[PDB]
Amino acid sequence: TKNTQTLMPLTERVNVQADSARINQIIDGCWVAVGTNKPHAIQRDFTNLFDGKPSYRFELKTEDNTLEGYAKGETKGRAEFSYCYATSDDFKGLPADVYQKAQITKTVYHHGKGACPQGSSRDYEFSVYIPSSLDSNVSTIFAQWHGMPDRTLVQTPQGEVKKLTVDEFVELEKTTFFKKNAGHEKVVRLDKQGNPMKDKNGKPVYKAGKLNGWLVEQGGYPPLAFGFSGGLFYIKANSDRKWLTDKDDRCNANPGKTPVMKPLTSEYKASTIAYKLPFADFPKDCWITFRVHIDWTVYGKEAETIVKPGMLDVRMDYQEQGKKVSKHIVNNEKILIGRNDEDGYYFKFGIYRVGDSTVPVCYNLAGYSERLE
Numbered sequence: 001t002k003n004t005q006t007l008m009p010l011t012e013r014v015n016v017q018a019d020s021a022r023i024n025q026i027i028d029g030c031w032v033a034v035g036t037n038k039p040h041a042i043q044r045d046f047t048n049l050f051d052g053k054p055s056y057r058f059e060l061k062t063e064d065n066t067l068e069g070y071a072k073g074e075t076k077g078r079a080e081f082s083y084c085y086a087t088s089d090d091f092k093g094l095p096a097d098v099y100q101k102a103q104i105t106k107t108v109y110h111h112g113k114g115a116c117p118q119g120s121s122r123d124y125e126f127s128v129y130i131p132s133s134l135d136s137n138v139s140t141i142f143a144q145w146h147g148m149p150d151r152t153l154v155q156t157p158q159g160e161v162k163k164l165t166v167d168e169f170v171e172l173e174k175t176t177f178f179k180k181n182a183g184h185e186k187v188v189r190l191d192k193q194g195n196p197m198k199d200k201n202g203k204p205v206y207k208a209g210k211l212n213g214w215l216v217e218q219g220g221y222p223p224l225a226f227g228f229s230g231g232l233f234y235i236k237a238n239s240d241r242k243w244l245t246d247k248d249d250r251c252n253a254n255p256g257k258t259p260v261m262k263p264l265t266s267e268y269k270a271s272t273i274a275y276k277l278p279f280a281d282f283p284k285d286c287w288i289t290f291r292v293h294i295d296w297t298v299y300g301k302e303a304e305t306i307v308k309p310g311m312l313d314v315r316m317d318y319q320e321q322g323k324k325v326s327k328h329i330v331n332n333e334k335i336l337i338g339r340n341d342e343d344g345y346y347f348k349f350g351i352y353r354v355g356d357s358t359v360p361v362c363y364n365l366a367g368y369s370e371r372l373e
């Protein structure tokens with residue numbers, strides 16, 4: 001379209017769990033970006049409009065994996081937009097310690113917009129443009145509905161699972177250094193001279209000592225993901241009914257080896273490939289609109305039961321040879337989808353390169369909207 005401005009880098013990034021987003025960090029009034037801040041990673045695209053608005057071009061080159069994988073030596077890349085985040089306005093008028101404690105418990109976004117409640121019914125819609133230049137063997141998730149773990153739910157060194165209050169978790173953090181989900185003894189960093197280090201505020205610099213037996217809920221597979229892997233486009237739903245998620249339970253369906261709508265299961269998890277299609281058959285160089293309806297599974301909290309299964313419906317619309325096409329790729333399928341958490345789920349789209357892959361990824365996304373139903 002316009003050449004006065006074509007590709008405009010959007011380099012501001014926000015850690016939604018630990019920080020509120022500043023005004024100059026919010027994109028188009030409804031997104032914040034997460035991941036590598038390389039200029040070419042995320043750019044507003046005036047050359048490819050969707051709904052009369054510039055779209056978002058995401059790109060991860062072969063050397064853009066800035067994160068570590070689940071296994072030693074492995075890595076992963078990320079450049080996404082998150083619909084859920086808190087702003088300073090969300091904490092305006094409250095005592096300063098509310099925000100301070102939210103940062104410590106990693107629940108800042110609990111005070112922001114963008115998340116749906118547990119067991120709710122929601123409609124989502126978004127569009128993606130996959131250029132013919134995208135390698136068929138990329139391993140990337142381009143849209144996902146992410147969980148919001150119980151940040152104060154822990155397991156004592158004796159094995160008991162307890163939901164602490166914000167204040168109690170804050171107290172625990174005074175003596176426990178949590179590396180993701182595992183708790184370690186908090187050790188005071190010392191320099192070569194043997195003198196204790198000091199952060200910007202003059203406080204000691206802590207480091208992780210040995211494991212101290214404490215665990216906190218963190219991580220977990222995304223309840224719903226749209227992506228490419230092994231030469232296939234797929235839609236995968238995950239369910240975790242355990243009250244305190246077990247990261248060691250690797251129940252995760254392989255798009256190519258798992259039959260459609262037949263969940264792979266463990267005691268507490270269920271992973272379902274709701275739909276799969278050879279990459280070559282995925283429409284290229286055109287905007288594809290996905291209409292997704294989700295009835296989130298209702299869980300029993302401490303009871304760890306499935307109170308009510310969920311449901312997933314997906315429609316895929318695009319223009320072919322000059323005519324409107326709409327495929328009902330996931331037809332009102334009863335399914336287990338979600339996590340047994342207090343909080344619900346939030347949407348993200350862009351690039352999440354997984355499977356220890358470094359294959360270049362580049363495509364455009366746009367037109368997100370969510371409604372109640």
Ligand SMILES: O=C(O)C1=C[C@H](O)[C@@H](OS(=O)(=O)O)[C@H](O[C@H]2[C@H](O)[C@@H](NS(=O)(=O)O)[C@@H](O)O[C@@H]2COS(=O)(=O)O)O1
Nearest residue numbers: 015017018034035036067068078106149180218219220
């Ligand atoms: O390895 C990751 O998955 C990961 C590493 C980075 O810390 C961060 O990625 S980012 O730098 O691009 O933002 C992010 O860490 C998050 C993590 O994804 C969250 N998982 S969740 O519990 O399911 O929400 C959680 O652990 O919070 C992490 C950040 O914590 S923080 O740095 O203390 O704020 O992904």
Ligand SMILES: O=C(O)C1=C[C@H](O)[C@@H](OS(=O)(=O)O)[C@H](O[C@H]2[C@H](O)[C@@H](NS(=O)(=O)O)[C@@H](O)O[C@@H]2COS(=O)(=O)O)O1
Nearest residue numbers: 070219220221222225229238247250252254354355356
């Ligand atoms: O090792 C895995 O379990 C794993 C590896 C791949 O990156 C990916 O599987 S996939 O190739 O079929 O997509 C998937 O990545 C997980 C990742 O391991 C999880 N880490 S955790 O929070 O500690 O559980 C998490 O980040 O979710 C990723 C994506 O899950 S998926 O969307 O269910 O695959 O699994």
Ligand SMILES: [Ca+2]
Nearest residue numbers: 150243340341
């Ligand atoms: Ca939980």
